[PDB]
Amino acid sequence: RSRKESYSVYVYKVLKQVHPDTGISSKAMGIMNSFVNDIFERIAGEASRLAHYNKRSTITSREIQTAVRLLLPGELAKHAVSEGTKAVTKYTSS
Amino acid sequence: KRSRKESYSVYVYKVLKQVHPDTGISSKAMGIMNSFVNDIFERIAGEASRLAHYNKRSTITSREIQTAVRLLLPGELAKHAVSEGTKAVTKYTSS
Amino acid sequence: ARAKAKTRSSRAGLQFPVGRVHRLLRKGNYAERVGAGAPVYLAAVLEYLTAEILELAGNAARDNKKTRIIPRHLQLAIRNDEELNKLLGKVTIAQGGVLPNIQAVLL
Amino acid sequence: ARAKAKTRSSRAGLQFPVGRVHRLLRKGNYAERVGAGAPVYLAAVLEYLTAEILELAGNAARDNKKTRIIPRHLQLAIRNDEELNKLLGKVTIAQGGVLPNIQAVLLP
Amino acid sequence: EPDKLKKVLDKLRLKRKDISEAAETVNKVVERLLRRMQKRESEFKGVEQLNTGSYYEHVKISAPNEFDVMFKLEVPRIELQEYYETGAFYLVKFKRIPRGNPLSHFLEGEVLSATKMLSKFRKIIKEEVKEIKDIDVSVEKEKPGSPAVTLLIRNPEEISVDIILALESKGSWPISTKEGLPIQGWLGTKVRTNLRREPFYLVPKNAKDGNSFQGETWRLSFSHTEKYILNNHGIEKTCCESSGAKCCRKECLKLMKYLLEQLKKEFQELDAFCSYHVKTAIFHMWTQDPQDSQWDPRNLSSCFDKLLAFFLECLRTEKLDHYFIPKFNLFSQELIDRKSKEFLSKKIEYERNNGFPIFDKL
Amino acid sequence: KPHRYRPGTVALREIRRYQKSTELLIRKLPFQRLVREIAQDFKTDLRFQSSAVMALQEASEAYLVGLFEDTNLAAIHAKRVTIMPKDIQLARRIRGER
Amino acid sequence: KPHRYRPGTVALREIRRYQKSTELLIRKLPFQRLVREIAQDFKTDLRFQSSAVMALQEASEAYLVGLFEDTNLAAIHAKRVTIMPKDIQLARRIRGER
Amino acid sequence: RDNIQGITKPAIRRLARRGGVKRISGLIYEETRGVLKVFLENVIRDAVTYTEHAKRKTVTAMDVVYALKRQGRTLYGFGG
Amino acid sequence: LRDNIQGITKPAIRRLARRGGVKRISGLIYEETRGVLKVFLENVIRDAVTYTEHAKRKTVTAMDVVYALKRQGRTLYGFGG
DNA sequence: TGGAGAATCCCGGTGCCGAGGCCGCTCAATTGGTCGTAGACAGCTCTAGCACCGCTTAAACGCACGTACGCGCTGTCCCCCGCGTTTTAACCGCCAAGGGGATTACTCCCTAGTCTCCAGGCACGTGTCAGATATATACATCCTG
DNA sequence: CAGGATGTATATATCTGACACGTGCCTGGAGACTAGGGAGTAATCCCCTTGGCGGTTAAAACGCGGGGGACAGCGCGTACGTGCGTTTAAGCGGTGCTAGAGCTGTCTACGACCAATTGAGCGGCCTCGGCACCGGGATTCTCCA
Ligand SMILES: [Zn+2]
């Protein structure tokens, strides 16, 4: 009677993608929620700050990309940027 | 064209002459004071935003600002700043 | 003559939810407007990072001849990555344990 | 009608601008609505803090026989106050220098 | 007539006597190579020989002058891309690897260039064996059509050993195998989880070149699990031991493998049939096999003809699943022409109706 | 005579044991008592969720372990194996809590 | 013979002089050259405002001074007066940059 | 009502072992007890502030998690 | 440009050390200081260049630097803040 | 415990340039009014923190023995510091050219807002299997004559 | 060294409770359309960045003597670790209770929105006074019998 949402469905799907024989405890699935929420808040705060510095009023893919380049280290940023660009390219073909 | 910009220099000057009626101030010190006021303004505003968001509310009130000030300043600085703020709010509500 | 719905995560080809992140972006006081390609980017990044951690986590789980991933395995995954350990340098994991190390001078 | 205007800081009795702070609070993406007494709190606290810094800074500038504040005096003030040094603990002051302090083991 | 079969196996055991000395001398030089490769400075620091046993049941072997070993090399984070949508050939890429991949010179863009890496391997192995001349051992290079570097040893006489590179991945047994190795109802789920928690292997082999990307294709290898199952060939893991019951499983495997070896070599048009065919069929037969009493040397001939029946029924319906990759089923006409399989059926009938004459050699 | 171990072997075994576990190393009733007594200075008649106290305990143990690591580093620096309050004070001074 | 000062007096005078000034202690052309050369790896044909380089110089000098303070603290800890790279490494390890 | 002596000496030895410490002077316990007390005082001050703002009587896990996150010591595993 | 880290002369590391309060300095300390300064500068200039490129400018302004420092916990007063 | 060199502060005069005041102006805060909605109360539920009681037993504690480590002393030997001479290249002033940020004007397309609809995610209920525990072995390591 | 005692990883047998499905459903996400406003673009200015030159002197560089500090070695004694026997109290399970959190409904006061005035704050101009800056004597402070 106090319906509260989380990310565990999608985390479970991704897990079944990368390791389709492994389970997960009930505390680790809370830890993944906390992790996702943390990264979400970081990226969103950084994109907000970026849009404020550039006198814009909207948040676009360019802000998200620059925020990711600001926050991820080394080859993580390269792979994340490639993933993001591939995703946007696939979405626009619709 | 001339692109007016804002700063807190007038009010810093008023406060200075009100607390020290005889001393002057350079311009880079005024820049440092601007950076300081903007910094801690931002600090308090972000903390009060987060607090209001945690508690399901959608308004920022003097209670939120009060507890954010209690969170950020240490010891007796918070006590005296809270006393100043509350006194000011009392005076204001009395129109 | 209807257009039976097709989720945005399906269009992007992702598992993470695009509409829920869109809603959280709008009701979160981040900007006045939100573009159409920002949630796709962010969900792709979140899904990539999740997969990147979870694979090494299932590996650390399956190293100790275990079936379920526990927090000890998540912690070992975090600390055994010279970038993930810099990204999560000041995070504490409950029931995570410590990193096994002994100083050479103590032997 | 239309009685003479009176700034909100005038009623509050302050020197900091209540209208500019109201606008900056309404444009900074902090919440949907902003109460009427929140800018009063914020202007009072900012004014208190700046006056609290400026008192020590003018004292330090006079203890050097100087009538004009410079960045060196603001840092001297900050590093000399025990409570202001915890607030601005992770802040760099341009042209500020350090506090003269030598370890006892190094003196002759 | 199981007595002749038992004695031909004994004949192989006197081969085995010759090949103990041949295999020991070749084994010792390759072991020496192993010791030397760990000391030389190159991208090949940790390169073990993969031990699949020494028996004929354990390794590639034929006429006494060729031996085979598997060399493993651990590889960083690998991502596979199916190229043969059967599910048998792949393109190889890497993953993030934040510190650095000391293999980037082996890649054409984002894909690992098997050609370049194999050329560097060939060069290094040939130079290293060239650097110590205790036993007379040299390298022979044939056309680069099958990637194996063969040493020729003059000790006592010609010994050839094809060194086959195998990539070592510990990651996840990619999705193409997800419902491979079905043994849950025969042995148990705990072995299968443990077995499938083992690593898997990638070996260079240029899939016949109706393709652009050449050399850059790889095949899956599961030699270690196959050896493990074979040396625990029974529902009881005590097989091939004193703790258990003598069965005709290893005997039937040798009977069919060796019979097919001799019959197929004497009619050389059918050389596309490799030893993996018999291992796959016998894997299916041993998993469907519920009874230990259905494999016992007193039943060598009956288990063998039942196995023959299994082989003909497998040929008949035009499908034999790779036991680890049911989606990649190699019995497709595009790689084995139907008429050739039926010709093999006729040759098999030839063996069955003549009373095993090919065994009547010496 | 019986089986006297030399000083430092049981210490290494305990190091190896506690670098492998994840349990909590402080008793729970003393920690809860201490928490309630500390909290009764800022406001009286308080209540605590059990999860809150468990979180506090986890955080404090992680903090103290992370501090003992730097104390050990300082000890190694001073050409010693025994840790001393000088080293804790140096650690907390460099970390920035003073 | 003339007026040889003992080792450590001119060092103290310089300490007292540089703890009283606020100027910049690094030459400006070398710093600017170094900045432009470093920046030409992330993107070519860049330009710099003078104020940006001045800010960078101020920040870097403040950083290095704040690090030398902790190096001195570590030196004092090790019962020495000479600073050694061990102490810098310890400082940067405790501070958290590794 | 000391209750700081309830942080025993064996517990401190265990915490030192987990941190890779072999020998421990005898004057280490009272100082690390004071350090822990300081840390707890800060965290509980912030947590009780968060609790009082909601006009509640009980301390929840979210108040502690927020008080921790605002000192740069985020904690995963207790909600949020 | 090459060999510019050597323009940080030893008497300048010495002057910075004097301002830091140290009395006696080894001779191998200078290479350590050059390396630390170089990696610090790299880490700061990477972010400053990220901000500048995002802004689609070709000159690095002082606000880009101020933001790059703020995002590392090294807020800097006196250049616009 | 002196007496002389040598930095360093302090005063004094000159001069210079930057703060402080004046003036002109413009745009943002104030006033006055309207409207909608967040939040404040009042009630009611019902969780979950608090208090208690036995009971077991593991952990703390106190004590003795012993050993190895910190610390203090001594002696040596490099190596940094203080000083003197040379050289070089930042630095300042300066001039010149041009690139690019910043402003204006113009245009378009993408998102909010509304409305209708329906599927995915949540809560609830089962079913079962990974793991914790207990027992029996064997291997690994330290230790001492 | 070489065995002996001890500790720890390793295999089995059993049960459990925590995880994995499965179902009902409701709320939030998707499709379609409109209306605006944010952003993209093109041109232009004019600021400011880059580039050069010449002279100087302050700083760097190189050398050198020497004293003091780093470092090694030896001894001692003491403080901390190991082991044992007692004892306390932590933890666990179960029970009961109620304060307070959490939800629900009502309404009311307060904040959004709009239009018009108006003064506060910004940009520019001018001016004097605080501060460099140089000399020049005072006065510390170091180096000796
Ligand atoms: Zn057998």
User: Count H helices, E strands: chain I?
Assistant: 3, 3
The structure tokens 């196995």 sit at E307
Q: Calculate ∠ Cα E198-E201-E203, nearest 5°.
A: 170
Strand-strand pairing, E149-154 and E158-169 = antiparallel
I71 CB contact with strand K at below 7 Å: no
Contact partners for chain D, using 3 or more CB pairs closer than 8 A, are B, C, G, I
What span, in angstroms and rounded, lies between the C-alpha atoms of D31 and B67? 16
Pick the closest to residue F74 from F63, F89, F60, F53 (CA basis).
Answer: F89
Phi, psi for E220 (deg, rounded to 5): -75, 145
- The amino acid at residue E334 is E
Residues E84 and E208 in one domain: yes
Length of chain A: 94
DSSP-H helix ranges across chain C = 8-12, 18-26, 38-63, 71-79, 84-87
What span, in angstroms and rounded, lies between the C-alpha atoms of C64 and C66? 5
10 Å CB burial of residue F10 (0-12, 13-18, 19+) is exposed
Quick check: A76 and C81 in contact, CB under 8 A? Answer: no
- The amino acid at residue I66 is V
| DSSP notation for F13-69 | HHHHHHTT--S--S-HHHHHHHHHHHHTTT-SS-EE-HHHHHHHHHHHHHHHHHHHH
SS3 C68: strand
Q: Which residues, 6+ apart, have CB-to-CB distance to G19 below 8 Å?
A: D97, D98, D99, D100, D101, I19, I21
Quick check: C94 and H77 in contact, CB under 8 A? Answer: yes
The dihedral over CA atoms of D25, D27, D29, D32, expressed in degrees to the nearest 10, equals 80
Q: Calculate ∠ Cα E154-E160-E166, nearest 5°.
A: 140
Pick the closest to residue E357 from E252, E266, E250, E248 (CA basis).
Answer: E266
Residues E87 and E234 in one domain: no
Strand-strand pairing, F82-83 and G47-48 = unpaired
8 Å CB contact of A69 and I55:
no
A42 vs I contacts (CB less than 8 Å)? none
Strand-strand pairing, H58-59 and F82-83 = unpaired
**What is the domain count for chain E?**
2
- B41-49, long-range: CB < 8 A, 24+ apart: B41/D24, B41/D42, B41/D46, B43/B72, B44/B68, B44/B69, B44/B72, B44/D42, B44/D45, B45/D25, B45/D28, B45/D30, B45/D42, B46/D30, B47/B71, B47/B72, B47/H70, B48/D30, B48/D38, B49/C29, B49/D29, B49/D30, B49/D31
SS3 A59: strand
Pick the closest to residue C73 from A31, B88, E178, H33 (CA basis).
Answer: A31
- B72-75, long-range: CB < 8 A, 24+ apart: B72/B40, B72/B43, B72/B44, B72/B47, B72/D87, B73/D87, B74/D83, B74/D86, B74/D87, B75/D83
Compare CB distances from D49 to B40, B45, B60 and report the shortest one's residue: B40
Quick check: F64 and H32 in contact, CB under 8 A? Answer: yes
Domain for residue B72, yes or no?
yes
The structure tokens 């006393």 sit at B83
Establish whether E275 is an annotated binding residue: yes
The dihedral over CA atoms of E94, E95, E98, E99, expressed in degrees to the nearest 10, equals -20
Distances I41 to A67, A78, D98, G40, H63 between C-alpha atoms, Å: 20, 22, 22, 13, 39
Q: E51 in the Ramachandran plot: left (φ > 0), alpha (ψ -120 to 50) or beta? A: beta
Best of E80, E172, E194, E200 to disrupt the C interface (most C CBs within 10 Å) is E172
Domain for residue B35, yes or no?
yes
The dihedral over CA atoms of G77, G81, G82, G88, expressed in degrees to the nearest 10, equals 30
Phi, psi for I23 (deg, rounded to 5): -100, -35
Pick the closest to residue C78 from C67, C88, C68 (CA basis).
Answer: C88
Residue E202: Cβ within 10 Å count: 22
Which of H20-52 are b and which e, b meaning 16 or more Cβ less than 10 Å from the residue's Cβ? bbbebeeebbebbeebbeebbeebbbbbbbbbb
8 Å CB contact of C101 and H73:
no
SS3 A71: helix
- The amino acid at residue C3 is A
- Residues 21-50 on A with a CB inside 8 Å of H are 27, 30-31, 33-35, 37-38
Strand partners, F46: none
8 Å CB contact of D106 and I23:
yes
CA C24 to chain CA centroid, nearest Å: 18
Domain range holding E132?
A: 15-172+200-221
- H43-47, long-range: CB < 8 A, 24+ apart: H43/F56, H43/F59, H43/F60, H43/H67, H43/H68, H43/H71, H44/F35, H44/F38, H44/F39, H44/F42, H44/F56, H45/F42, H46/B71, H46/H70, H46/H71, H47/F52
Give the domain CATH number at A88.
1.10.20.10
Residue E288 tokens, joined: 């469907």
Quick check: E169 and C55 in contact, CB under 8 A? Answer: no
What are the extents of the domains in chain C?
1-107
Instruction: Report CA torsion sign: C32, C35, C36, C41.
Output: negative
Residue C22 tokens, joined: 């869109």
Pick the closest to residue E304 from E238, E362, E356 (CA basis).
Answer: E356
Domains within chain I, CATH numbers bracketed: 1-79 (1.10.20.10)
Residue G49 tokens, joined: 């405002």
Instruction: Find the C65 Cα to ligand 1 centroid distance in Å.
Output: 30
Distances E332 to E240, E315, E321, E341, I71 between C-alpha atoms, Å: 35, 11, 10, 10, 61
Strand partners, E203: E219
Strand partners, D69: B25
Residue H18: Cβ within 10 Å count: 23
The technique is cryo-EM
This PDB structure is determined at a resolution in Å of 4.4
Residues E183 and E80 in one domain: no
Residue G57 tokens, joined: 């110089």
Beta strands in chain B (DSSP E): 24-25, 59-60
Establish whether E18 is an annotated binding residue: no
**What is the domain count for chain B?**
1
Residue E267 tokens, joined: 């009619």
Residues E105 and E246 in one domain: no
Residue E227 tokens, joined: 């050896």
G98 CB contact with strand J at below 7 Å: no
Quick check: H13 and H24 in contact, CB under 8 A? Answer: yes
Q: How many angstroms separate the most distant Cα atoms in chain H?
A: 48
Distances E314 to C104, E329, E351 between C-alpha atoms, Å: 62, 12, 18
- The amino acid at residue G10 is V
8 Å CB contact of D92 and I76:
yes
What span, in angstroms and rounded, lies between the C-alpha atoms of H65 and H76? 9
10 Å CB burial of residue C2 (0-12, 13-18, 19+) is exposed
Q: Calculate ∠ Cα E148-E149-E152, nearest 5°.
A: 130
